[PDB]
């Protein structure tokens, strides 16, 4: 889904698999905060949500615990209790159109 209608999915009771998160080289914008970037298997907070959108280009950097802008004024906003963080991807011909 797009940014204007951002979709969320709650992860139910299951054993968290975070080992392949850091060993994957496909992640190049894991500039994110919160808990320590090593003890992910030692934390099992009660509920976890994953929210997805397709914002473009350099607008991703405005996602921060407290920020304003054309994206972070009338769209997804980050509070000061945002435990967890953000993973970004890279665009290609998979999401593209010549026309």
């Amino acid at each position: 889904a797009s940014v204007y209608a951002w979709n969320r999915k709650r992860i139910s009771n299951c054993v968290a698999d975070y080992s392949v998160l850091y060993n994957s080289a496909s992640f190049s914008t894991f500039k994110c905060y919160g808990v320590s970037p090593t003890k992910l298997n030692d934390l099992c907070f009660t509920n976890v949500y994953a929210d997805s959108f397709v914002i473009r280009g350099d607008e991703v950097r405005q996602i921060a615990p407290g920020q304003t802008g054309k994206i972070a004024d009338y769209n997804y906003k980050l509070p000061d209790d945002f435990t967890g963080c953000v993973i970004a991807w890279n665009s290609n011909n998979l999401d593209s159109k010549v026309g």
Partner: single-chain antibody, 225 residues
């Protein structure tokens, strides 16, 4: 009949304080964007600040912190405070509503002048002196190669306020007649004026938006051989 009035024609002592004023004539300032542009006579135009609905303000890269802009909905004003100012600050301080995506700077203010104590976007052609009776081509190049529709065109006037010609290089603004056309993509955008009229000889600028702080061209003048 929208009108944007300004009144700031006053001399400033070294390290003085001044308060500009921009008003509104029918549209509320609490639901539309406002922006300030420095004319910089003898050079192309620049950018100062942008305010969104809400009231978060973004400043230019050159000037940081010292500027203090504020909005007063009770009196419907767009106040801007100049604190202790340094050298090289004498220029015009136009204020205008910003709808860059749908119409770039459709209406402007009237202009002012504040004195002092005691993106790579370029316009290629230049003066290109010609005569009425044919067309002409104006080329604007950008180094970042913005994708589709993030460049607009402006027309100046001696002593008057800048005017909008085309927004997004695809469709002209309201009141713009069919003697102006625009095309081009990738790196360069071309503008053509057909059937030159006496009320067409004016400075033409190309400006970029939808990106990092806005930049205008150096300035292209129309002259008669």
């Amino acid at each position: 009949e929208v009108q944007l009035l300004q009144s700031a024609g006053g001399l400033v002592q070294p390290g003085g304080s001044l308060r500009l004023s921009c008003a509104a004539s029918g549209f509320t300032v609490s639901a539309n964007y406002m922006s300030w542009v420095r004319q910089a006579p003898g050079k192309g135009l620049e950018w100062v600040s942008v305010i969104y609905p809400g009231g978060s303000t973004f400043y230019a890269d050159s000037v940081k912190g010292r500027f203090t802009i504020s909005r007063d909905n009770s009196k419907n004003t767009l106040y801007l405070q100049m604190n202790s100012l340094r050298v090289e600050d004498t220029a015009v301080y136009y204020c205008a509503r910003d709808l860059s995506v749908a119409g770039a700077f459709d209406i402007w203010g009237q202009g002012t002048l504040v004195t002092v104590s005691s993106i790579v976007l370029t316009q290629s052609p230049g003066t290109l002196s010609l005569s009425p009776g044919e067309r002409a081509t104006l080329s604007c190049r950008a180094s970042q190669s913005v994708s589709s529709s993030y460049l607009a065109w402006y027309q100046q006037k001696p002593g008057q306020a800048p005017r909008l010609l085309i927004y997004g290089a695809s469709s002209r603004a309201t009141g713009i007649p069919d003697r102006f056309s625009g095309s081009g993509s990738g790196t360069d955008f071309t503008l053509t004026i057909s059937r030159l009229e006496p009320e067409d000889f004016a400075v033409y600028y190309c400006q970029q938006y939808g990106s990092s702080p806005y930049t205008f061209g150096q300035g292209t003048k129309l002259e008669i051989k």
